[PDB]
Every structure is written in structure tokens, then in C-alpha cells.
């Protein structure tokens, strides 16, 4: 009628309005502030009538949709209530200030053993549910956290580990040891991206390990999917891993000369990216002028209140000390890092004698690289420009021949080697970190996952494709687990038989990863052809998947920026979070990073023993798939709980809820997908106590005196509610979508009808109340007897 709806607003996400006209596909909205505007019908949502209402669980809303969720969490955020549930899913909005009281020892103790529904929403309740299910089901647990870099994820993990160790640990502070090491993990696994100064580029699963008595014995950091492409190249607003800049900004002149470091504009592996340091007025004065690149001198430092290349170098050194890394192992790490940097400066020129030679201007780079990595310069020169092959492939006796590489193959061998070295170094840093909280054995674990979420830009390339693929698969895992929890809840509540209609995203997943016919195998097939081309790869995808629901040519995009992208220059995939247009230029080169065997053997038998120890045919996309599947196998072997961390604005400001930005994160985090899944079941539900308090004011005193369950049984029975839309559970009334709003209107719209209906339920209610105490007497007698069964 004249009811409030939510309609789109460009900075708040949604605004309140009235529907004043209708059209075929859109609605005309009058903002509650006569500047009408048009909105697509599926972007307009019913609003709660009470705009100052706040519920702890969004399932208590009379309408559960993206707009009512956004508003409920906004209202809660304005009262510093940062935590809110959707069923068992925790939504967590970063406060950007230290909230008094809620993380104290007293609060920790108050959450122990308590069911999720029985305390206010809190990260501790999610930690405690994981624990109880671990103890009772003898099942390891995962706590799967989504969010942008900086969305409070680091602090969230800290609270979980602190809750678990302080509650269920024995004076041993695993949480603090894990945390002391962070400067080292971030140095090797974090980097500046266009949106995030301190973005983690790997999947990290922080496990607290437990014995059979469910007491903490230790911790383990599992790591997955380090982003390899960033090692050799970056876009102009991005950097390589922090370590490279900390080392160049902060290393003493003695270490500089030994590693032959110089400002980062001098390194191919740094100089396509942003070569500027994070520095403030004081730390800038501590960086020698010869560490500073031209872009730095012209443009100044990058500004961040919590990151500084010079000072973070010192902090990283302090943490390496605080956890046992001796100074020789320190310099070993640094030697490998600078070895990789000099590797990247080696250039090649076409021979024309066949193959290529190292340019003569690359002689010092080669000299530096071979020394740092402990390799003969001549051996390196040869393995960079030539490879070994057998003269046969199919069992016949063959000979080893030497095959000169072209320049392009030599560029690839130098970069492949760079990537394998750095990745093994990362693997080493993490193992070393794990050597700070080792444990003999354990029966189960509770782990917290942190991994880059779904993202898109104006230009999306292979990096985005892999990240969004990873998230498509995690989203399927999230949907499956929520589906299972809801089905289980409906059974435990006694709601009877019900199918929750599930529209899966297996088809999107199959589009990307299916053997032979998936986009990643079609991309590998492109490598085998005479003249590999991105355009041919892309036409093949469109040809093979002509009829695919989740694939479109770029031309079909709603956006203007994709207007002139050709059919063979990109594709659109319809992900869980929305449509993404990928430009496929460079997909083929980005799909190859293989290191030919002779060069890998060279490095595996470095003169230097540290390098040797580091090291003790498949495309990038298929290695990505394989490692992602290993991550998923782990998650699938645990009970799962879910936290969605939300960044309230881009300015680190307290008390500033930016609606559109938060909306976009709720979409990208898979919350809206989850809400869509929940519409197939009973997404609104309310406890008898909640219903009793809302509606007793409308009932005779006779009814107000009933306990909440019999009050509701009475009201439910008196109204003659349709058996499909309304379900009377054990502890709650469950509603089909919108049906709680409809219940509320019945309760409000005709007092005389209501009064009469309640009059007429009198008899049924007298009896129900007879039978309650009656059968409760009969139950006390049966119990009394069961104790007598011992006879």
C-alpha cells in the first residue's frame, strides 16, 4: 500500500521511499525526502516498519533481505554493537576503536559453554561453538572468515585464539607466540595492492591443536596459494612483497654492499610497480638517499599510520630475534631475496649464429646473482639460455641433447627460477614460524582461515580470475554448510518434511575447472598449438560454451566501459557475487611458469647449504586448481563456522558507516547468496519469549499469564494460520519468506476479529492446559519408575 520500501542510493546503498508508479521492469520511487527516480524491481525491497528496531539475529526480522540486513547492522553499529548474527553466521563490523569491556577476562568466562542463541552476538560465541562441537563430535573445526584487507580480520583471529587459549589452554600462551611472528609472515606474504596497503597474498589457516581431553597442546600455520606472479611484476599502483622494500630502505650500508642493493628503480622485479616507500616525515630522514628511487624523490613517500618500510624492517629484525632466528639465518634469508632481485636483471639477445646469449650489460647481474645463490656464473649462463631434452618420448632408447632457448624462453626460465626460489623461501619462513609452537601429537584442531575475497576492477585479468574462482568454490562450500545447518535445524525443531530448493553454482565452477572442456584446460590446450594466442583461446571458450548460462561475450555487459571489447578479447562470468568481465590479453603467458629441469637441478645443488635445504609440466591455472582443492579437502574434513568481517569506511574512522561500501562487501562476501539460499526454507523465526513480549499487549490478561510457549500455541491456534506458511517448532515459530510481516498485520489490522478469534480458542486452551500438567504428572511418574527399573 503506502508501506516503506528500500530502494537504491549511491552512497548509503539503500534509502527509504514509497512506490508511486510501476513499469515493466522498474518502479518509480519517491524518497521519503518529489525527486522521484527509477529502480529495477529486484533492487527494491520491503522495509521493517520500525526504523529504530535492532535485533541480534537478522532471522528475527519480519523481512530478511540485503537492505533490511544492511539497516539492522547500521542501527547496531551506531550503538557500538559490532556483532550480529544471521543464524549461526557472525557479521563483524570493524569499530576502528578499542571497545571497553567486551574482550575482558570476565566476558571470556561468560561465553564458556553457552549456546550461541543465549548470549549477545560475539566472536567468542563462534569460538566456543567450534570448541564444543570439537569436544563432543570428535571433529576438527574451521572458522572461515571473509573480508577485505583491513576489515578487522587480523584482530578477529587474535580474539578467537585468545579466547581458545585462555579458556581451554593450560597457562601456555600459544596465541601470543603465533602473534609475535606476524612481522615475518607479512614481510614475505603481504604486499601493497591498488586498494590495500597491507594485503595478504596467500591463504592462511591458523590452527589451534588439541589433545583427547580437549586441551591446547600447540599451533600450526598452514599456508596455501602464495601469489607467484607478483614476484616478477606488478602494476603501477602495486608493489612486490614488503620484504624487498624493507630490505632496500632499512638494511645497513654494510648489508647493502654485500647484497649489492640499490634503490628499487634499478630492479626489473620491482620497477614496473610503485617504487615508493611507506614513510613519514621522521622515517624519511632515516633512509639513505641512495635507497630512494626517482618516483619517491618526485612524488614523496606513501602514507599509512601503521606501515613503514624502514621501521618495519627493524621490527621484522626484532621479531626474528624474539623467536630464535639467529643473525646468520637472517642474512641467509636476505641473501636469497637479493639473489632473486639480481636474477631479474639478467637480459638476453638473439644469437643468430641458434638461440640466445646473456647480454653483456648483464654480466654484473649474473655475477651478483650466481654469488648470492651460490652458483657458477657459467653454469647459470648456460642453463638460462639452454635446456636438456631426450631424443625420444615413448620408451625407445634415447640420447640427451642440448637445446638452445629463444630469448622469450630464456626470460621465462629466469622468471620461473625467481618464482620457485621465492616460493620455497616463503615455505621456509612459515615452517620456521611453526617451529615456535611445535607439538608432539594432537587429536583435533580449530583453525581460522584468512584468504583474499572476491574482487573486480575496471580491468580484470588472470589474477582476478583465479581469486574469483577460489571464492566461487568457497562460496559453494559456504552454501552447502548453511543448507545442511538449516535442514538440520528444521528437523530438530520438529517442522516436518520440507525441501529447501537449492540452486547450486556447480555450473559456474564446471565452466572454469572441468577437465578438457573447462576454461583452464582450454587455456592449457592453447599452449600446444603452433601459434598460441589469447584471442584463439578466448574464441575457443565461447565456441565450447555457446549455450552456457554463466558465460557471455563482453558486448552483452550492462556497462559502457565494455562496449568496445571484442568477442575474442574477453569474457563475462556470472559469479555468485555478480557478473565479472575479464579481459583475456596475457592469459596464455600468465598460464606458464614452468622451470626446465636442468636449471632447477642447478639451483637444487647450490654451493650454499641454506639454498639446498630450501629445495628439500603443469600450468599455473592447474597448479592453482590443485592447491585450491587441497585447501577445500581440509575445510571439507572439518565442522565449519562462518564470520563476515566488514570494513565500515576507507578512512580508518570510527563511527562512520558507509552504506554502499558495506553493501558491496555483504554482496562480495557471499552473504546475499546465503540470504537467497535461506528464502527456500524458513528464514524468519522468533522465539516464544520474543513473540510473547511483542504481542501480549493485544491479548486479554488471561493469556498474558500463560508461559510463552502456551501463549503462542494459543495465539497460533486461535488465528487459523495456513499450514504451509507457518510452522510451530520446539523453541520458535518459523515463517516462510514475508510471512512474519503478514502475521504482524493480522495482529494489528482488525482488533474485533482478533478478540473474537481469541474468545473462540478458550476451550482448546483450557484443555491444552489440562493436558500439559496432566501429562507432566504422568511424566514425573514414569521417571520415578525408570529409577525403579534398577530392580
Amino acid at each position: 500500500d503506502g508501506k516503506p520500501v528500500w530502494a537504491p542510493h549511491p552512497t548509503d546503498g539503500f534509502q527509504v521511499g514509497n512506490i508511486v508508479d510501476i513499469g515493466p521492469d522498474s518502479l518509480t520511487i519517491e524518497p521519503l525526502n518529489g525527486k522521484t527516480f527509477l529502480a529495477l524491481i529486484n533492487q527494491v525491497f520491503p522495509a521493517e516498519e520500525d526504523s529504530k528496531k535492532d535485533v541480534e539475529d537478522n532471522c528475527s526480522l519480519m523481512y530478511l533481505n540485503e537492505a533490511t540486513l544492511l539497516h539492522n547492522i547500521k542501527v547496531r553499529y551506531s550503538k557500538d554493537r559490532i556483532y550480529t548474527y544471521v543464524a549461526n553466521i557472525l557479521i563483524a563490523v570493524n569499530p576502528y576503536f578499542d571497545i571497553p569491556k567486551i574482550y575482558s577476562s570476565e566476558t571470556i568466562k561468560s561465553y564458556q559453554g553457552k549456546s550461541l542463541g543465549t548470549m549477545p552476538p560475539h566472536v567468542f560465541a563462534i569460538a566456543d561453538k567450534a570448541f564444543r562441537d570439537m569436544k563432543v563430535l570428535k571433529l576438527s573445526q574451521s572458522i572461515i572468515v571473509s573480508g577485505e584487507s583491513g576489515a578487522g580480520k587480523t584482530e578477529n583471529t587474535k580474539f578467537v585464539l585468545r579466547y581458545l587459549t585462555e579458556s581451554y589452554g593450560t597457562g601456555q600462551d600459544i596465541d601470543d607466540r603465533i602473534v609475535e611472528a606476524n612481522p615475518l609472515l607479512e614481510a614475505f606474504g603481504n604486499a601493497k595492492t591498488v586498494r590495500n596497503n597491507n594485503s595478504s597474498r596467500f591463504g592462511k589457516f591458523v590452527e589451534i591443536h588439541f589433545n583427547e581431553k580437549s586441551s591446547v597442546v600447540g599451533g600450526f600455520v598452514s599456508h596455501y596459494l602464495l601469489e607467484k606472479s607478483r614476484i616478477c611484476v606488478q602494476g603501477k599502483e602495486e608493489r612486490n612483497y614488503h620484504i624487498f622494500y624493507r630490505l632496500c630502505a632499512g638494511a645497513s650500508e654494510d648489508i647493502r654492499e654485500r647484497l649489492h642493493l640499490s634503490s628499487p628503480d634499478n630492479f626489473r622485479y620491482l620497477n614496473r610497480g610503485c617504487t615508493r616507500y611507506f614513510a613519514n616525515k621522521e622515517t624519511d630522514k632515516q633512509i639513505l638517499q641512495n635507497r630512494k628511487s626517482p618516483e619517491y624523490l618526485k612524488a614523496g613517500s606513501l602514507k599509512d599510520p601503521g606501515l613503514d618500510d624502514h621501521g618495519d624492517f627493524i621490527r621484522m629484525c626484532t621479531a626474528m630475534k624474539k623467536i630464535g632466528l639467529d643473525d646468520e639465518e637472517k642474512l641467509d634469508l636476505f641473501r636469497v631475496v637479493a639473489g632473486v632481485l639480481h636474477l631479474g636483471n639478467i637480459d638476453f639477445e638473439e644469437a643468430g649464429s641458434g638461440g640466445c646469449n646473456l647480454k653483456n650489460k648483464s654480466t654484473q647481474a649474473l655475477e651478483y646473482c650466481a654469488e648470492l645463490l651460490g652458483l657458477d656464473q657459467d653454469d647459470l649462463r648456460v642453463s638460462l639460455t639452454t635446456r636438456v631434452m631426450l631424443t625420444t618420448a615413448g620408451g625407445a632408447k634415447g640420447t640427451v641433447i642440448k637445446v638452445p632457448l629463444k630469448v622469450e624462453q630464456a626470460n621465462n626460465a629466469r622468471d620461473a627460477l625467481a618464482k620457485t626460489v621465492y616460493s620455497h623461501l616463503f615455505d621456509h619462513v612459515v615452517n620456521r614460524v611453526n617451529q615456535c609452537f611445535p607439538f608432539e601429537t594432537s587429536s583435533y584442531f580449530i583453525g581460522v582461515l584468512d584468504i583474499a575475497g572476491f574482487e573486480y576492477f575496471e580491468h580484470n585479468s588472470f589474477e582476478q580470475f583465479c581469486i574469483n574462482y577460489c571464492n566461487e568454490k568457497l562460496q559453494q562450500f559456504f552454501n552447502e554448510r548453511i543448507l545442511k545447518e538449516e535442514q538440520e535445524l528444521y528437523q530438530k525443531e520438529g517442522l516436518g518434511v520440507n525441501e529447501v530448493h537449492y540452486v547450486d553454482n556447480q555450473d559456474c565452477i564446471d565452466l572454469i575447472e572441468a577437465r578438457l572442456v573447462g576454461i583452464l584446460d582450454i587455456l592449457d590446450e592453447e599452449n600446444r598449438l603452433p601459434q598460441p594466442s589469447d584471442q584463439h583461446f578466448t574464441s575457443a571458450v565461447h565456441q565450447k560454451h555457446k549455450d552456457h548460462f554463466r558465460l557471455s561475450i563482453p558486448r552483452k555487459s550492462k556497462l559502457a566501459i565494455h562496449r568496445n571489447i571484442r568477442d575474442d578479447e574477453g569474457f563475462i562470468i556470472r559469479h555468485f557475487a555478480g557478473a565479472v568481465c575479464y579481459e583475456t590479453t596475457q592469459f596464455v603467458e600468465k598460464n606458464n611458469d614452468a622451470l626446465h629441469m636442468s636449471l632447477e637441478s642447478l639451483i637444487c645443488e647450490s654451493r650454499d647449504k641454506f639454498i639446498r635445504e630450501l629445495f628439500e609440466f603443469i600450468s599455473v591455472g592447474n597448479k592453482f586448481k590443485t592447491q585450491l582443492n587441497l585447501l577445500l579437502d581440509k575445510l571439507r574434513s572439518t565442522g565449519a563456522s562462518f564470520i563476515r568481517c566488514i570494513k565500515p569506511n576507507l578512512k580508518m574512522t570510527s563511527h562512520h558507516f558507509e552504506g554502499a561500501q558495506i553493501l558491496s562487501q555483504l554482496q562480495c562476501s557471499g552473504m546475499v547468496s546465503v540470504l537467497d539460499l535461506m528464502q527456500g526454507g524458513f528464514p524468519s523465526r522468533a522465539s516464544f519469549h520474543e513473540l510473547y513480549n511483542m504481542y501480549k499487549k493485544y491479548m486479554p490478561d488471561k493469556l498474558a499469564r500463560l508461559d510463552p510457549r502456551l501463549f503462542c500455541k494459543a495465539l497460533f491456534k486461535a488465528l487459523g494460520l495456513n499450514e504451509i506458511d507457518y510452522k510451530f517448532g520446539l523453541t520458535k515459530v518459523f515463517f516462510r519468506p514475508g510471512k512474519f510481516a503478514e502475521f504482524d498485520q493480522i495482529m494489528k489490522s482488525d482488533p474485533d476479529h482478533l478478540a473474537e478469534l481469541v474468545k473462540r480458542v478458550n476451550h482448546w486452551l483450557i484443555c491444552s492446559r489440562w493436558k500439559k500438567v496432566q501429562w507432566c504428572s504422568l511424566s514425573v511418574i514414569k521417571l520415578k519408575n525408570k529409577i525403579k527399573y534398577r530392580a
Binding site: 525443531e493 510457549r709 523453541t731 484443555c767 492446559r769 493436558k771 501429562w775 507432566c776 525408570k786 529409577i787
Partner: protein, 145 residues
């Protein structure tokens, strides 16, 4: 074992035990109700009764558990003797009849908040023959309604 309707009645009994409405019965909740109906089990006798039936292992009784806790092997003569001891729980003095202060006696003990005019009305609803008190015939009619 139990029929459709009989399961439904014990769920409402279950609600009398589960005062806080979390869908779970604790040892504390279990004894109170037995006590309030003139019973005296020990914190040892109850826990042993929970453990025999606490399959899922979480240290509290859900409705499924509750029902198995009711049940045992017995004859159709021993079962309807339970019904008669139930019929004898309300009648405080023992004169074959539940008075308003007596039907009211179970109520307050049970924790049902009502008024005397309400009590008197519950009586009037069960009285089939019209006398003004409730006979085992009626009791079973009512209980089994």
C-alpha cells in the same frame, strides 16, 4: 512405540520441564518438576538416568532423549496404572476429587500463574456428566482429547 498424538502431549510436558525454553532439559530442571509433584530423587539417581539416554553426549536431554527416558518394557495393566497414579497426584487429601484449591495445588507447585476464577473454569470444562468434579472416566476423556 508411542503414537502420533501421545508424542505431541509429552512435548508440552517437556515444555514444563524446560522452563527457560532452550529446548534442552538439565538435571536441575528435571528434579524441580518431579519434586514439585511430591518426589525426592537424588543428584545421583537423575544423572544416571540422563547418561543411560544421553546418546548425542552433550550432557542435556532433548525431546528425543526425553521420550526414551519415559519408555520401558511393560504390560497394558502396568501402563494404565500410571494413568491412575497420575489421577491421584491432584487429589491432595485423597477423597476421590480434585477441588479448586487442589487442582490449584498442582498449578502453583508446577508454576502456572492463574486466578481462582480461572481454576474454577478448568473444572467446568472437564465435567461431562455435569456434577462439578472430574472422574477417571472424564480425566481420560480429557487427557486423551
Amino acid at each position: 512405540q508411542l503414537t502420533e498424538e501421545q508424542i505431541a502431549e509429552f512435548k508440552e510436558a517437556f515444555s514444563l520441564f524446560d522452563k527457560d525454553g532452550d529446548g534442552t532439559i538439565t538435571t536441575k530442571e528435571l528434579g524441580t518438576v518431579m519434586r514439585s509433584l511430591g518426589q525426592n530423587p537424588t543428584e545421583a539417581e537423575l544423572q544416571d538416568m540422563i547418561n543411560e539416554v544421553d546418546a548425542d553426549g552433550n550432557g542435556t536431554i532433548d525431546f528425543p532423549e526425553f521420550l526414551t527416558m519415559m519408555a520401558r518394557k511393560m504390560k497394558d495393566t502396568d501402563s494404565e496404572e500410571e494413568i491412575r497414579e497420575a489421577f491421584r497426584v491432584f487429589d491432595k487429601d485423597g477423597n476421590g476429587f480434585i477441588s479448586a484449591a487442589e487442582l490449584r495445588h498442582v498449578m502453583t507447585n508446577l508454576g502456572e500463574k492463574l486466578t481462582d476464577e480461572e481454576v474454577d473454569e478448568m473444572i467446568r470444562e472437564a465435567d461431562i456428566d455435569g456434577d462439578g468434579q472430574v472422574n477417571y472416566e472424564e480425566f481420560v476423556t480429557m487427557m486423551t482429547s
